[PDB]
Amino acid sequence: ALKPEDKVKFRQASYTTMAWNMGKIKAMVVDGTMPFSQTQVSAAANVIAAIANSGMGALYSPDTLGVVGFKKSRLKENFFQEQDEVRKIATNFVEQANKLAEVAAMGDKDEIKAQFGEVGKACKACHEKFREEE
Amino acid sequence: ALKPEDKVKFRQASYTTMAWNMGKIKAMVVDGTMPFSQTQVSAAANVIAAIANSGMGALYSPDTLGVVGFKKSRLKENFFQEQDEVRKIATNFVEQANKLAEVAAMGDKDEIKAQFGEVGKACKACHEKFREEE
Ligand code: HEC
Ligand code: HEC
Ligand SMILES: O=C1O[C@H]([C@@H](O)CO)C(O)=C1O
Ligand SMILES: O=C1O[C@H]([C@@H](O)CO)C(O)=C1O
Ligand SMILES: O=C1O[C@H]([C@@H](O)CO)C(O)=C1O
Ligand SMILES: O=C1O[C@H]([C@@H](O)CO)C(O)=C1O
Ligand SMILES: O=C1O[C@H]([C@@H](O)CO)C(O)=C1O
Ligand SMILES: O=C1O[C@H]([C@@H](O)CO)C(O)=C1O
């Protein structure tokens, strides 16, 4: 199976990959710091949905607490104490990510901006709660 | 725009995310060390295709040579000298990744194994050529 170090690397890599693709959508539909491209915004949305559906629950186990992947894990132990809250936030994130990829395929900038805002809220719902602040 | 350090982190994260998802397909259709799941193999294929289509060419510029992302970049300078060879290998990889996601949606283990083998060859075609060995 996967060593703890690999579980942490693979989840840090997955989240960092989503963050690159989230920044590209933000640049094109929120900040206008990149030209709007239907192809590029859809491609970025599709990465977020695919990773959201990739079964990242397999990368979460107690033996990953405090373990270095690319860097020391920022997972808080309360993740293992609050499984009802984790299920609520995770299922919400998958639903919002799926919707973003659906909207971004042919949606206009304002439709995408609305769906993107719901995904951003879903990402943020793990902050301070399950991820150590920095 | 993106600092060199961010370009290296985002490309290292993208490749590591594909490697996690490639390992899951290998376990289910090549080594039989994980139970075959149509849902899970399709989800893993969809991550690889989505990242392959994510425009990772934006993360490649000469000012990323020798720069630390998660770790010091393993990009070789000959990437910038061999753009015809890079275009051949990159377009091949996108084509094979798209085909893997198409096959993995309803394909059987042997169909997926064949498409997965073509993607593995496409990943390997950047080795020693554009990525430093270790
Ligand atoms: C809880 C169910 C989460 C959801 C939904 C998202 N993230 Fe997250 N993120 C979470 C944890 C517990 C951690 C720490 C991982 C570790 O082991 O250290 C993170 C981390 C990140 C990071 C930093 C990654 C790194 O290289 O170290 C980023 C950039 C990040 N997360 C972004 C992010 C985005 C963009 C999300 C929505 C698309 C998202 N996360 C969801 C917990 C959760
Ligand atoms: C050339 C067009 C590439 C293709 C196609 C793939 N990879 Fe690759 N990979 C490449 C470079 C130039 C590098 C170095 C990146 C850097 O800046 O250091 C890599 C790196 C990886 C890594 C290590 C990532 C890390 O955390 O440091 C892995 C695990 C990796 N690559 C895997 C991989 C897979 C599975 C691919 C096909 C699905 C794949 N790569 C394609 C160049 C190229
Ligand atoms: O590191 C971070 O991860 C999340 C996500 O938004 C990534 O962009 C966040 O809010 C950060 O500053
Ligand atoms: O606007 C954004 O919100 C998401 C989310 O991660 C918020 O934390 C993200 O990374 C963006 O670019
Ligand atoms: O790295 C960060 O730490 C805090 C917190 O959200 C982490 O959970 C924050 O807002 C960041 O961007
Ligand atoms: O680090 C590696 O990256 C490629 C890829 O196969 C990832 O699994 C490879 O062959 C490695 O050992
Ligand atoms: O069998 C595999 O091949 C790919 C490719 O990266 C080969 O280098 C990979 O990572 C696998 O699990
Ligand atoms: O890390 C590795 O270095 C060599 C080379 O392929 C890198 O380009 C190899 O086969 C690995 O798995």
Author numbering:
A (entry chain A), B (entry chain A): 2 to 135
Share the article's original sentences.
Cytochromes c' are soluble periplasmic heme proteins widely distributed among Gram-negative bacteria from psychrophiles to thermophiles. The vast majority of cytochromes c' consist of homodimeric subunits with each monomer forming either a four-α helix bundle or a β sheet structure, called cytochrome c'-α or cytochrome c'-β, respectively.
The NO-soaked Fe(II) PhCP-α structure differs from that of the native PhCP-α in that the proximal His-128 ligand was dissociated from the heme center, and instead electron density consistent with an NO molecule is observed at the proximal heme face with the NO N and heme Fe distance of 1.90 ± 0.15 Å and Fe-N-O angle of 105°. The N-Fe distances in AxCP-α and SfCP-α (for subunit A) are 1.73 ± 0.10 and 1.75 ± 0.07 Å, respectively, indicating no statistical difference in Fe-NO coordination lengths among PhCP-α, AxCP-α, and SfCP-α. In the heme proximal region of PhCP-α, Arg-75 forms a salt bridge with Glu-135 near the Arg-132 residue before and after the NO binding. This salt bridge formation may confer conformational rigidity to the heme proximal region. Although there is no favorable hydrogen-bonding geometry between the NO ligand and Arg-132 in PhCP-α, we note that the distance to the Nη atom (3.4 and 3.7 Å for the N and O atoms, respectively) is somewhat less than between NO and the Nη atom of Arg-124 in AxCP-α (4.2 and 4.0 Å for the N and O atoms, respectively). Using structural and spectroscopic techniques, we show that the thermally stable cytochrome c' from Hydrogenophilus thermoluteolus exhibits slow heme-NO binding compared with mesophilic and psychrophilic counterparts, a difference that we attribute to conformational rigidity around the heme.
